[PDB]
Amino acid sequence: SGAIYVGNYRVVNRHLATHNDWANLVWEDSSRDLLVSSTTAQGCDTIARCDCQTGVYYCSSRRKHYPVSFSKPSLIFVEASEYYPARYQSHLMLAVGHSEPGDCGGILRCQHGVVGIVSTGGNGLVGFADVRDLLWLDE
Ligand SMILES: CSc1ncccc1NC(=O)N1CCC[C@H](C(N)=O)C1
Numbered sequence: 001s002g003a004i005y006v007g008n009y010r011v012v013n014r015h016l017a018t019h020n021d022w023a024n025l026v027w028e029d030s031s032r033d034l035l036v037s038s039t040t041a042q043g044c045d046t047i048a049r050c051d052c053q054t055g056v057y058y059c060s061s062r063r064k065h066y067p068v069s070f071s072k073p074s075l076i077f078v079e080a081s082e083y084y085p086a087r088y089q090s091h092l093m094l095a096v097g098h099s100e101p102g103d104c105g106g107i108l109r110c111q112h113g114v115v116g117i118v119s120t121g122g123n124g125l126v127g128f129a130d131v132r133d134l135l136w137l138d139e
């Protein structure tokens with residue numbers, strides 16, 4: 001679990017969005033595993049606007065942060081799960097690191113701010129849904 005709180009927006013994994021997220025929907029994209037809902041309170045976070053390919057992510061299954069080198073946002077094949085059929089997920093960045101399903105939502109940050117959230121994993125890999133291209137989150 002986990003979310004990004006920026007301005008009057010909450011960014012979560014689309015597959016973990018609650019009834020309240022869907023009732024306050026601003027934007028969602030199944031191909032990116034992202035959903036953004038509106039909030040009444042001002043958020044605590046800042047979004048990176050950069051091309052960093054190194055950062056640190058929070059791994060809830062280890063209660064620890066890990067440093068990672070990650071690929072540029074791309075279209076990556078993701079096998080079927082209980083939440084989605086087998087498909088290509090876009091804007092996804094992979095890195096070598098530990099993850100378990102419950103780790104989705106953990107934030108990846110660089111020196112400039114929030115880069116994305118944990119969205120996929122398996123066999124020593126971890127995938128992050130990028131949010132750096134969503135410029136409207138800042139306005
Ligand atoms: C951190 S998630 C993970 N980690 C390790 C093993 C397995 C997983 N799960 C995983 O990749 N899923 C399940 C949840 C929806 C994901 C998606 N974005 O399509 C795909």
Ligand SMILES: [Zn+2]
Nearest residue numbers: 050052110112
């Ligand atoms: Zn950066």
